[PDB]
Symmetry: C6
Subunit: 67 residues, 6 copies
């Protein structure tokens, strides 16, 4: 029902997206990893080693793709 | 009922608009593409290739047109 | 009932106001144009041609007048 | 009941206060004028002519006094 | 029940704390004075004379101590 | 049920994480200490002496790990 759950549910892993959130924190190019809906948590990670980011889907504004 | 639904429903695709959101993320001149209302989702895209931005209508503050 | 509806209902068109919103987006000197209350929408516009701005009244913080 | 209504109800007019809102917009030193509680609207103003500010009490974070 | 009420209830007066709010307004080193829970209002004050700041507890994010 | 409760309950103490909140206040490299889920409060602290931070979990956006 929530738009965030759908726009994150059908994204195949491995594609790089840029996500803007309710706080205005502009998160740069991050390769999508996973999204589990039963609890509503999306695993992403960007190169740093490796830096894994864990955010809450219900407070996600927008996702942008690149082609 | 929601103002965001109507201000995005009767706007023809192809027109360039500038949208300000609840997080203050000022998105520049972007050409409209589509707005599917049944699940409340709107598509925009700006030149980059092409950069498609996908946002949630319910958390959309304001749209501005140019003439 | 909502304070924003009242502070926008009795403003005569043509007067310039400065409006601050919930995102901190400071919108400069804009001449008021219209405010239709049944759906809660306010038409404003500033000189650019002309740049028309559409915002949601329910998510409007404050308006300031000049004398 | 609401704390904002209480902190605005018994401030005598003419005293200078500095208010801070939910958007982080810091209002500078202004002279308090009025607070009509039946609809919940505060009347403040700062010197410019005169610049009158109309901000909803329900979305006011904090007020600071000076001695 | 609210975490802010508890973290402000057991803080002894006179200790200097740094508080972050929902608007991101970072308030520097300020000595705690009082917090009355029945109406949910907390008083702080920093050196300026004296500058007393009055905020609403329900919209307080976090407090930090120093040792 | 809340995602923040999950991402905080099963982090072992001693690991350094970087948290981001609803206000965009970015918390730097801070070693996690504790999380009392009964009242929903996370205990963290960073080197200064020592500076302890007390931030409500329910208004926490995201946590990031490092490897």
């Amino acid at each position: 029902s929530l738009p965030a759950r759908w726009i994150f549910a059908r994204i195949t892993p491995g594609t790089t997206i840029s996500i803007v959130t309710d706080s205005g924190d502009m998160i740069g190019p991050v390769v999508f990893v996973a999204f589990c809906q039963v609890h509503g948590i999306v695993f992403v990670t960007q190169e740093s080693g490796q830096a894994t980011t864990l955010i809450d889907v219900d407070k996600v504004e927008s996702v942008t793709f690149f082609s």
